[PDB]
Symmetry: D4
Subunit: 201 residues, 8 copies
């Protein structure tokens, strides 16, 4: 497993002239206003990953932000509701072309109530996915391998979920959900993170 | 209060050459697959209302459906999530240009947890809004007046909510919510009515 | 309101050569093994009622039991699940031709969650229904009038519910529910009173 | 273990000239209106099973439906409330001569609160019973063996439960429950799937 | 209503040469270790009451304590579990001949779940019973009348409850409950106030 | 381990001329009115046990009942609240000299919330205690050994608990609890099994 | 009632050369990061009040901030946990000499669970205290009178609570609570608003 | 591991001329008014521990109390809220210079909800931490080693937590929390142990 670790930003976009990029983050916690972004991981789907350590107070990451802003490149997340929020809060750019494996699982794997990444990878790919101070100056090898494992499989999952969405004729539902997901993340940032805006009560 | 009661459909659209129409429904209950649409009420905002009794098994309402399908006319609902679902289930057309006073209340009246129509009308307009077999062949006068009261005030509420959304700079949030609302209703019809599709669990 | 009060049993069946009889009970509480039957009230639907005081330890009531056993006479209850249980526990005969207004309400009044007798009488008939030691040797006038009020309206409710069941095409569902209701009461007597026998868990 | 896999329907009824047949299903989920029937498994009790893959949109299965409709053949289920609902929804025929091992367990194994098939098979027979896309065009061997395991033991369980029902004198209770079970399934299909129709509230 | 207000103790026992005395207390709250006893009220059942203000730090009340210790005089409480605890904590003597109207209500008024003193007095006697700093140096007239109202009716209630306990043949159950009640209060003082000592868990 | 299995009753009391006997039961479930007594196990504390199979409908067991009635012999239970109830319901005699290890645990092992027999035996004695049709005509060896294991250790536990009750000065509390326990069991039989008779609500 | 309404800030501090000032706020909601401060009300305790409308985006209020920063002047709040948070978030200064009537009520009115301002004013002073867009450009007379009513009584309450704290010897407890309250508010601002920092879990 | 076991008190303070001491206790339970202090364990951080058995009724421990009272020595606890309460209740001295690893964890390990000592030691130090009658006259070796394990690591944890508090700029928050913690313990002793004194309700 080749994992390239960077400080601050990608050196260039030579490895990311592609149609879709897998994205994940690590933070100090679940609350973007308190808990800073510490790591961003990326994969092109070729079995390699980039792990970018984000410094305290860092406001810019131009190569990463070009990827996040490029409307011709789909950003793949698992539970992108969180990653979109923390990315937009940190760098000021909200991606608007996204695919979320958690929404896709809820729209296709209707025979189960377990939609976590480990269960999805286990069922769909027979891949076994295995408290950490992500703000440490030097990440451990175990940390780097764990961080990389979260992006290595998202392309294959997206392909399978696209097949299932076509099979059950739910493609337009998923498309509308993905179109709204960035605004759901914005609603989280604005103060409605605990509110289902569509519920009767 | 002039309330025009119709059987099946509007006679024509002479009163609805307008930019926005207030819409509400009455049904036999909260479950569109079991509980049929019984009444549709409309208002142009001029203080009059149309009350249309829908027959059992009725599949078409061409004048009403032209209004529901006309993209140049905004359909105003209170909690349109339900009305859109029952309308689409009954006539096969899902409106796609909508405004919902419940979403607007949740985005602007942040100082309260009561977002029902009675409280909104009381606070914003000083208007007092006051178990019924809506499938009865002949509706009572009390039924007709109650049914009309649900559409008589939606234009004024929409105007006030638009002022507040501009004041708090939440117009684009509301616009995205309204754009997604028809798909939220479709999700309800397809079997996800009890599921928040965006929740982590 | 003519209310005839009896000790032990009806004097004869001269007033009950009819197709359906309204039945209700009063007890010392909700648990038939602890809380004895104290009063049985009956009505033919003609606006009069019979109120029969049941003695402690009384094992037989032949005229009443003939009515309860007569398969040609429908016994009308509101929430007959309880009355059937206490009657069978007290006199050893379980009626098997019954109509229950609570089951009928749950099958027809789908637009509300309030299925109590007061709400049903209020909505369907515009009739206002208004801690009591029912084992007292002499019942008060208020007790007698309250006891009679529970049977005076069941015939009219049954007629309306039959119309609604026909309208919504749920007659065979109701018939099967009424056929099972005596066994639901037996299940209560045998020790499953707190168990939904059909639930997955 | 001989397991015969069929497409669409049984080829004939040569193996099912018997008094009782074990039946189970697999689906895309718990909601019959959204989640289609994918597999039906059958056993005569001789240690072999038939596994029938049901196609999307399939409306007819004449040999299977003859079995389901034959009043001289008892259909054995575990939690037949679900299987009856999905079968009736798919093929339009509701079986009316049934035996359910879950109801039988709740009526006889009163010393435990675990009524699942694994626990019943473990206790009564010392047999160890061990997220799956059941709509796959080709089922895996593990899927076929799991699907067969759900019907291989129902005859032996029915025999034991009949002995216990006789011992505790609960045969007529069980008979009435089995007679009502198809209507409980119909109630589920009609929209009362979340409602205990016999509860006070 | 003659209400005699005393400081510290009764002047003598001339009014309490009787077989049963009604007793109640007022405190600064529900926790005897934190919230001191402020008032003790007594009645002989003759329609008069004694209201004794207890000083901060007061350790002795000899006339009162003689009454509390006299085994020939039954102490009547409503929910004596609390009063016994606070009395024993304050003066070091636990009464051991008691009658509690709350236990009696739970053993006889099985047709209701409301066992408060107001409901009992309303049902059994047609008597209407109507945040207060009970440690105030001078009690208000409203305070004195309220304090007296809690003891004026306990004799009549005890008489009625004794009749009902005889009628339902529960006298020995009640006697055993009253015998254990002082130890239940001791258990409260020792630290088990939140624990049902007889529960399985 | 010598375990003597008997039908109906002990042959004689030659092994039970002792000051305390360990007692346990097995039944068809937790509800004495529905679930019959199937087995009674006894031990003198000498490392042997007697296992008595009780027949359906058996009304008498004279040697056992002499033991249960002998006021000079303490009956030791773990959670005697249940065993006393089922014994009194079956044979008509309620023991009145008892010791309960569950009450004792709750009064002494205040540093834990786990008061089950396995945990008590593990902590106090370093003894490892390891769905069963107890009404079977022939009990299995595993059943007999399990049934015996529930009485083999109660004498040693009683001795230790008596030491702890003396150490923490809670002997009189325990004595009062044991004196009330038979009436708690009677309250269960009379219909208050789900009610804490001493609670405020 | 003289109520002086100001825009932005007090004109001067001529009325506030005093030892204690009553303070309250109004906002657009309970979440300081989303819901802006709209009104600040002040009283010297002389029966008059100042009502200061705060503009959107206003960052400074020098006279008000001098009062908030003056360590020689005690700021009286009811539930100051919120007001301190919103004031510090808006103007950047956290008061550090405070008195809170809610903490005082919880430390002294131990005989009740209702600690709201209405109940406190009703009990202690016999004063009757009687959804509002507080961001409106012009406040209504009803709004102004309601806003003033929240500060008119805090001095009298503080005096009474100081008497009670002295009486029950809880002065040092209250002093430590008031000393920590500003840091509790800071914890709210930093992201622990939903966390009891002292709880075990 | 050198563990020195003492009766009553330390023999002298020769090993505790240090700036910080790790402290833990063992008791008979969670309620200081009922459950006595049984053991106090101390460590200087040098890998050795002192285990002091406290006798029933012991009121004084002069060397220990000098340590607890010495304002120049920081007392380190894990969840000191409890230990401070039981120590103050037993010896009458409340320490006022403290550090709590549970508060520190809640202020720094924001990426997890598990703040127990085992998880903290596992994550921060890679140290594996592994129902007991602590009032026994002779403690077992397993008891002594377990008791010592609770203090052996608190110095190292305090050092790491101080680094993290500096990194996230939360030092003054923690300092204020530690300053209030002794009064939180006093509030527990006075009767508010179940009350969050800062909550709105």
């Amino acid at each position: 497993t080749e994992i390239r670790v960077h400080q601050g930003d990608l050196p260039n976009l030579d490895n990311y002239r592609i149609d879709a990029v897998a994205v994940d983050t690590e933070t100090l916690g679940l609350q973007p206003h308190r808990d800073r972004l510490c790591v961003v991981q990326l994969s092109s789907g070729d079995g390699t990953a980039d792990v970018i350590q984000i410094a305290k107070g860092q406001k810019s990451a131009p190569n990463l932000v070009r990827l996040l802003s490029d409307r011709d490149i789909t950003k793949i997340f698992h539970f992108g509701r969180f990653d979109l929020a923390i990315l937009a809060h940190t760098f000021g750019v909200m991606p608007d072309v996204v695919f979320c494996t958690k929404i896709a699982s809820k729209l296709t794997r209707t025979y189960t109530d377990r939609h976590g990444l480990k269960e999805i990878c286990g069922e769909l790919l027979n891949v076994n996915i295995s408290s950490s101070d992500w703000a440490a100056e030097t990440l451990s090898r175990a940390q780097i391998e764990y961080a990389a494992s979260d992006v290595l499989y998202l392309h294959r999952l997206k392909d399978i979920f696209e097949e299932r969405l076509k099979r059950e004729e739910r493609e337009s539902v998923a498309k509308a959900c993905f179109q709204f997901l960035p605004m759901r993340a914005n609603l989280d940032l604005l103060g409605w993170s605990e509110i289902d805006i569509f519920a009767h009560s």
